[PDB]
Design a binder for this molecule. Structure first.
Ligand SMILES: CC(=O)N[C@H]1[C@H](O[C@H]2[C@@H](O)[C@@H](CO)O[C@@H](O[C@H]3[C@H](O)[C@@H](O)[C@@H](O)O[C@@H]3CO)[C@@H]2O)O[C@H](CO)[C@@H](O[C@@H]2O[C@H](CO)[C@H](O)[C@H](O)[C@H]2O)[C@@H]1O
Ligand SMILES: [Cl-]
Ligand SMILES: [Cl-]
Ligand SMILES: [Cl-]
Ligand SMILES: [Cl-]
Length: 139
């Protein structure tokens, strides 16, 4: 059934290459933001943040937060989300990157800045979505 947002998905023993995380939900009408935050304690190893209205443009911001400071943003203008519509986000952990696909299309890759993959042990999901499912498997 419905999951409550913000939602915290534990990743027992951290992430590993070949782990595939799948998030299903629906963007609310008039959404502003979505965020997936892969955490290593207080640090955010990988923040994946679609913004629906940043100076009247849609953009995806990726970043990492270390010791309560945000780093250098990486931005992607390809924006596969739409207000009101169902989505699937898949994050595949690879040896050197997270790889993100939305609705079965490749979107972006994010190079690992936090290198202790085994300590990335929680995924926070938040923002203007109805969350249907969040799960992981090994491929
Ligand atoms: C104000 C806000 O949105 N705070 C949330 C925080 O947002 C920051 C994050 O998106 C970073 C990524 O680089 O950018 C920051 O904005 C930048 C901006 O992009 C730059 O152009 C320039 O202007 O500098 C600013 C400041 O660096 C955003 O402020 O993102 C975190 C993580 O998702 C949010 O935290 C969570 O909110 C959830 C809501 O339910 C939940 O509480 C969760 O537990 C929180 O960790 C901040 O709220
Ligand atoms: Cl953690
Ligand atoms: Cl939209
Ligand atoms: Cl890789
Ligand atoms: Cl590290």
């Amino acid at each position: 059934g419905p999951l409550i947002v913000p939602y915290n998905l534990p990743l027992p023993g951290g992430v590993v290459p070949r782990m595939l995380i799948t998030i299903l939900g629906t963007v609310k009408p008039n959404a502003n933001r979505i965020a997936l935050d892969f955490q290593r304690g207080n640090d955010v190893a990988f923040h994946f943040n679609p913004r629906f209205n940043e100076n009247n443009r849609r953009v995806i911001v990726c970043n990492t937060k270390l010791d309560n400071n945000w780093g250098r943003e990486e931005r992607q203008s390809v924006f596969p989300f739409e207000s009101g519509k169902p989505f699937k986000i898949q994050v595949l952990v690879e040896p050197d990157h997270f790889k993100v696909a939305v609705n079965d299309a490749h979107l972006l890759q994010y190079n690992h800045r936090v290198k202790k993959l085994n300590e990335i042990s929680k995924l926070g999901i938040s923002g203007d979505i109805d969350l249907t499912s969040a799960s992981y498997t090994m491929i």
